[PDB]
Each structure stands twice: as C-alpha cells, then as structure tokens.
C-alpha cells in the first residue's frame, strides 16, 4: 500500500496566476507531480490560459501509484498540440516487477525489456535501486 | 481436541521437503 502524497505543480499555481495574458500562454518547464508517486514534465511551453489551476489535480492530470494519466476523459481531450496534450517526460515511482523490489536475474532484465516495449512511450531509464521508471510520450 | 491440523501441516511440510530433495520435477519434451 504505497503512500499517496500531495499533488504539486511547478511553476506553482500562485506563480502562474501572477503571469500576464502573454506569459500564461507559454508556461515553460511546466511540471505536475505527486509526492511518492511521480511527475509529468511537459517538454514544451504550454498554454494554461484556458485551464483551471484549481481543478487540475485529479481532473486533468491523475497521478496514482504506478499510473499517470493526462486528460482521462477521451471526449474532452484537446487536439494534439493544444493544452497539455503535448510531449512530456513522465517518471513513475514503484515501477518494479510486481514480484517486488527484491527481483533480480533474468526476471529483472525481462521487466526492463517490457518497459521498453510499452507502446506510445520512449524509454528513458529504469533504476532498480529506486524503482523509478522514466519515459517520454509525444501526446496523450 | 483437533491435533489433525498439526498432522496435516506436518504431512504437507514433508511433501515440500521431499519434493525439494528430488529437485524440480521438470519433464521436458525433445523433438526426437
């Protein structure tokens, strides 16, 4: 039963609220995360001018143990390139084999093979000493 | 009152250890 921490974003919601109409259309290095779960780092400037910062956690970006979802409702997902439907760097903690952290040998390297083969993802890294799976997506 | 459970537990423990002595009972097939 992995502990689900609190959501967070960078820049903070306060910082984004303080941005003018120009700046909020091109928030650089926008990141949404949840402690002891993972994070989504968008790899381009994003347009947050039509996104409620008070209804972002759990509504648009859902971070659960071993699970990252952006725009969970397919019907209300913006076109590719608009909103948060852009390339991103996702990191998921606790992404070890279901057998547990104490899995080595062929079973562990088999797991890394399976991570690389997950469709619509580009494998970045997996570290057994932390259990963090990092990978890139082009859209959601 | 019910010592049969200890007997079951011991019996199955013995099956395990017995299967361990023989080693993995693996029967694979060859082409010919």
């Amino acid at each position: 039963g992995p502990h689900m921490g609190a959501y967070w974003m960078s820049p903070t919601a306060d910082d984004i609220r303080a941005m003018n109409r120009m700046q909020r259309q091109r928030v650089v290095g926008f990141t949404v995360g949840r402690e002891n779960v993972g994070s989504v780092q968008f790899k381009v400037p994003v347009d947050l001018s039509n996104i409620n910062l008070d209804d972002l956690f759990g509504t648009i970006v859902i971070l659960e143990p071993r699970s990252a979802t952006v725009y969970p409702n397919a019907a209300k997902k913006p076109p590719m390139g608009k909103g948060l439907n852009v390339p991103a760097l996702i990191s998921l903690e606790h992404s070890w084999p279901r057998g547990g952290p104490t899995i080595k040998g062929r079973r562990l390297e088999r797991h890394i093979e399976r991570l690389k083969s997950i469709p619509d993802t580009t494998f970045e890294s997996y570290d057994p000493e932390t259990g963090v799976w990092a990978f890139s997506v082009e859209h959601f | 009152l019910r010592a049969r459970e200890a007997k079951r537990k011991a019996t199955l423990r013995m099956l395990r250890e017995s299967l361990a002595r023989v080693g993995p009972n693996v029967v694979r097939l060859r082409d010919d």
Partner: protein, 538 residues
Amino acid sequence: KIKSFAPAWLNEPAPGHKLFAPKPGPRRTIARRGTEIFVACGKQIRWGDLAQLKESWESRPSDDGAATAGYRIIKTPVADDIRQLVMSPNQDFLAVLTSHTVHICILPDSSHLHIQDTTPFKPKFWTLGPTTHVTSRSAVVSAVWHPLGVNGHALVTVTEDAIVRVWELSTADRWTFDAPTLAIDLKKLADATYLDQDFGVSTSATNKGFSPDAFDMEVAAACFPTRDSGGWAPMTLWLAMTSGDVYALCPLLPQRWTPPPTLIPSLSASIVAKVAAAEDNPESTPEERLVAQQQLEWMSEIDNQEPKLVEEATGEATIEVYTRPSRPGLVPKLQGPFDFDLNPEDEQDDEVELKDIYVIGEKPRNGLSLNIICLLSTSGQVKICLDIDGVEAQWLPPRSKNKRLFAPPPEPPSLLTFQTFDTLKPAEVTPDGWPMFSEDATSPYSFYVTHPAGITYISLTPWVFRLESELQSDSEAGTEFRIDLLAKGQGSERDRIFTQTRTQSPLAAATSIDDPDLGYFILSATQTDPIALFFETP
C-alpha cells in the same frame, strides 16, 4: 475413404458435418449441453443435437436448417468473429464473446431442432455492457459464470486491463445487462492500503494512461474453481497474467448468492477454528488476528440473515438465497503475486508467460482436500501447483488500524510447485500460441490442453487420491516414509490424443462429453472439419 478424425455421421456428406464446414487469441468456439452442441463459425452459431444427427445417418435411405433434423443455424448480432462460447450452469444462457464484445443468448427450446417445428425461430440476444465491452475499450479475456450465482445467471467478465465485473442477469430488467452490480479495478486494488478506498471504475475514464501494469497486470485468463468445491473455493476468483503472475480474490460474491446446504456450516466451523487458534496462541500477530476478525465479521452478516426462497428458472425446486455481507467490505484483498515454491529455475520467456489457468477446488472432507492450481504457458508447458497454505477470505485493513513500524513485512502468498511438464515439442511451439485448458466431464482431476499443434489428455488421479489418503491417515507413524514414495511417484499422467500436421489451423478448445448413448469422447474442430475421438462406447 480419407483418413478423417471423426465418425462417418460427422463427415461429409452427412448432415452433422454442416456444423463444422464453412488472429492471436483463445478459441473456445464449441459449447454444449447434454448431447447438444453450439459451434461458432464467424458471426453465426451452428446448433445441433449429436444424437439425432447420428440417428439420421444411421437411418438414412439408399436456409436456417429447418429442413435438416437436429440442425439449426443461429444468426447473431456480433460485428466480429466469435472467439468464445461459455455455457451457463443451468444451460439456459450462453455467453458469446468476440475480442471486445459480449452477448448473452437466451438459448431456445430444443423442439426447434425438429423439422415439425414451424413456429418462428429467433433466439433472443442481449448486449452485455454496451458502453463497457466495446472495441474502443479493453478487450474481454474471460467470461465465467459464478458457481454460487442465483439461477446460474450471475456472470463474471474480466478484461486485459484487469477489470473484474460481476453481472447479475434478469430477462425482466434490461438494466441488468447494461451495467454490472460490481466493478473492480485490480490495478487500483493491488496498490491500495485500506478496504474503503476506491476500487471502482469510471464511465468517463475512456482515455488510457501509462503504467507498468499495462503488461505486468495484463490478464491472460481467469476462472472459478470447479464446483462441488468446499471451503472458500467457490467464492475465489483466480487470475493468470501474461507476465507469469497469479492472483486470487476471495470472497468474491454477487449481491445475492445461493450456497449448497453444506457450504455455510463448513465455513462457520473453519472461521470459528481460526479465531480460536489466533486467540489461544500468544505468538499470534495482530495481522493474523485481524484476518480471523474480518472473517468472523463477514460470517456474522450471514448468521443474522434469513435466507429467501425462490423458484428455479430451469427447475422444479426452491433454494436458499442469501445477500452478500456488506462488512468488512464488498471488495476483498487482491492476493498475489503468488510465489511459486520449488519453481523450476532458468525458465524461458515462453515458459514464464501464461496463457491459461485451471483450478480444481478443494473438496469437502470425493478427491483432494487442497486446491490444485494448473498453469498453462505459451510454450504449452503445464505447471501443477498445490495450495498448501489455503487461500481464504481476506480484506485490506480498516482505517481504524494504526500502522506499526516494528511490524514484520507481509510475506508474499505461496503455492507449492508439485510438477512441471511440456505438452509440446520445441518444433511445435508457436511464439504467439494460445493453448487452452478444458475440463473433463467425468472427473475434475482430469483435463485437456488444446493447441494448434494438437490435443493432450492429462490426469492427476490416482496420485491426488494417494495424497488425500495420507492426509487422512490413521497411522501413528511412517508419514515421512510414505510421503517420500508419493513424491517419488510419477504423479500425473499425460497422453497425446491428436496431432495436427503441417496445418497452422487453430483448434476449438476440447469439449468433453460423456453420454450414455453416444458414449465418452472429446469434441474439437479445425476451421473446416470436426474432431471426435472416442474413449468408451456403450
């Protein structure tokens, strides 16, 4: 006289041959009730009685099929080739699966097989989860009827993305087909801490996210134990992932359920005994006492409950109906991944990767007082595991419980690997093959393995009987001596009954039939021809 693998009354130009004559996944395209069989061929189901079709070819002189006795066509509303047919317990409902969709066929009166029948022939088909089991969502992997479902009308479906859905069907209420009574996301449950957390599924959650469980909890198959099982077995859903892992859910019940007369009293004794052992033992951990507590709480909902009495849909007799206990919770703990003790080392990828699971439930204290979990790999490897510890009812803790730092880590659940053997030669192994288990009609401890390469018969008798006798042994001594001989015994027997040569055509999952008139035989089929191999005639 071409060498065929079926009797003359199932080969062309016999009328019985019409049942058979005209993509990765399982092919359970044959189902049966008595001597009747249902054969999926594309988007239609071919219905026929083997008894009449036999007689027609024996008493021969020298298009819905209404002109042919003992043969009828069943057109279906499916939009893709049928993959699986699953007969219900009382054999009145038939589950019809494509890769993604599920239809329930209300099986028609058998009188429609006679030529004399002039009345209109339009078997009712019900769509199951129109917005749930769809091509735009996760594929359906297993459909199994709940052993304890009222009127045998409770169905469990499982998808690749490990969502378990219980449907409690009533033809008098369309809504029962539209939505499930219970929906469990195993991926949420696996990582949950408390029994009251959210394990449900959102109708709005249509866009897939990203997770290692996309492969690690990709479901290959699920089953309930063979019925006539005792203890917790008939409330235990077993699952096998393509990753090689095995899971169990217990107790999984629909909102309402029907136990055989002996189930509840046997469980009560089992629960009472477990509470006693937990309390009497001073070395009992607070985690061990909680399981006993939760089970006692579950049972208390049943003791203080008066069972309702309702008719049998296909019957002439009333039976007790209970409601599911609400405490400790509706969703049991997900148990697993099970550790395979004495597992073979250096298993290959196609040996670890699972494609089917078949569980023979413990029998009340005729057979073995232990669950037997059988696992089928892509390679056709079969693994026979024994549930030494005994899977039982478990739930996650309540939020009332305070986490203790000096508490030991929960050791993973375990199965004992008793035996592992190939059923295919290396040359017969296909990289994406989907071999299937099938139950034997005459004994739960025998079963079949079907694969495009061929069909194999397997039996765990008399070995399971020898183990049970030792478990019930009246002898003061000699246990370790006698067990050693049993472990040295070859155990299960296996024999190939059929081999397909130079034909990559997949075979319909073997269907065992034991009729007093037609005899005892296996039924399978190629894309075009039948396979009926007999073992005992009258």
